[PDB]
Amino acid sequence: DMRNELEEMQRRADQLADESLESTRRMLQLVEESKDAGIRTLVMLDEQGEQLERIEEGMDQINKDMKEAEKNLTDLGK
């Protein structure tokens, strides 16, 4: 009558982490810095676009003025 039976106990392997808290924090800090740099680039790019738009009008005005002056001088000369 040496017929034995058993029961079982369970253990849980550690969840997936303990490497997600050293590279993670550095990743977040770098992401924040990149976000700030992107915001600054946004602002600078908008300012540059405004300045180019401003330049356009003066360019067109000088072109028109020179063309009209040349035509007038030619007309009077002949």
């Binding site: 079982e8 106990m9 369970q10």
Partner: protein, 83 residues
């Protein structure tokens, strides 16, 4: 202490967590590194269940038995509790 420390083996489980604990305790109390600024006191009701290894020279090695008091002890206890 008998809850944690029991004879190696003599347990029916696959995890085997009752042996690593004892081995770690034995290594820390008496290991390669010499730590000599600690004293450990362990009290129990069933000295037999304790693993034999822990009871030897070097490890523990001083053991006291607290028995039932005598007439003088009974008188002192009654005086203490009736003061």
């Amino acid at each position: 202490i008998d809850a944690i420390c029991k004879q190696r083996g003599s347990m029916a489980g696959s995890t085997g967590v009752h042996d690593t604990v004892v081995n770690q305790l034995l290594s820390k109390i008496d290991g390669v590194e010499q730590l000599n600024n600690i004293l450990v006191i362990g009290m129990t009701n069933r000295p037999d269940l304790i693993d034999e290894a822990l009871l030897r020279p070097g490890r523990l090695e001083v053991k006291m038995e607290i028995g039932l008091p005598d007439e003088k002890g009974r008188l002192q206890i009654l005086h203490i509790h009736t003061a």
